[PDB]
């Protein structure tokens, strides 16, 4: 099939900057590349079709270009209402419509160091039988932050699942909540529960740990 590689995966720009997003196709499409926009939670909205055709009701600051495989979407002067995720979608494979990965345009801000807090399972939960260890990364930027679970200095993968909030309306920072879920028997079998955190704003990895029942 046809794969649409959209780059960069995520870029940081301020208002008024000349923003450019590249979309490349696995094979050749004549000019049947379309550009869409989607705000968080809202539905997608059409911006460009036929690779440089502006849709009715769209600001003129958006412009498409490119033919063949390499296509470009340009915002001459960025505006506050333009911070969203932009997708590129090919159509040449008519009955095999494929979309790109998208390029979320974030409010470029300074690098924010996450605040890391580790919460042990509650005694009321331990009565039920399950145990949850909650690792909270607060107010950081960008969202690219690695959360690693260590139990007795043993790396853990597949036991937990993360959840991230959209970019904040006040300081444009993200938050993440990793929930390490396990049974009671697997909880007493180990003593040390840590949460290693790696972020672009950290000069070195930070670990928040606690010993069970101390």
């Amino acid at each position: 099939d046809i794969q649409m590689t959209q780059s960069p995966s995520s870029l940081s720009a301020s208002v008024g900057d000349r923003v450019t997003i590249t979309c490349r196709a696995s094979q050749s499409i004549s000019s049947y590349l379309n550009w869409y926009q989607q705000k968080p939670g809202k539905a997608p909205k059409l911006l460009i079709y036929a690779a440089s055709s502006l849709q009715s009701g769209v600001p003129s600051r958006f412009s498409g270009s490119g033919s063949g495989t390499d296509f470009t979407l340009t915002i001459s002067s960025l505006q506050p209402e333009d911070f969203a995720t932009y997708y590129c979608q090919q159509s040449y494979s008519t009955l095999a419509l494929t979309f790109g990965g998208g390029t979320k345009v974030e409010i470029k801000r300074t690098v924010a160091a996450p605040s890391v807090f580790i919460f042990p399972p509650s005694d009321e939960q331990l009565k039920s039988g399950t145990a949850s260890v909650v690792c909270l990364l607060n107010n950081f930027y960008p969202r690219e932050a690695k959360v690693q679970w260590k139990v007795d200095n043993a790396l853990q993968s597949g036991n937990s699942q993360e959840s991230v909030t959209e970019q904040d309306s006040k300081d444009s920072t993200y938050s993440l909540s990793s929930t390490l879920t396990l049974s009671k028997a697997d909880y007493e079998k180990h003593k040390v529960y840590a949460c290693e955190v790696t972020h672009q704003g950290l000069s070195s990895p930070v670990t928040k740990s606690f010993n069970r029942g101390e």
Binding site: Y32, N34, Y36, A43, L46, Y49, Q89, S91, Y92, T94
Partner: peptide, 14 residues
Amino acid sequence: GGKLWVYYFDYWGQ
């Protein structure tokens, strides 16, 4: 939309 020989998506529902 039907403006081209191919398919493009004009308006989206929620």
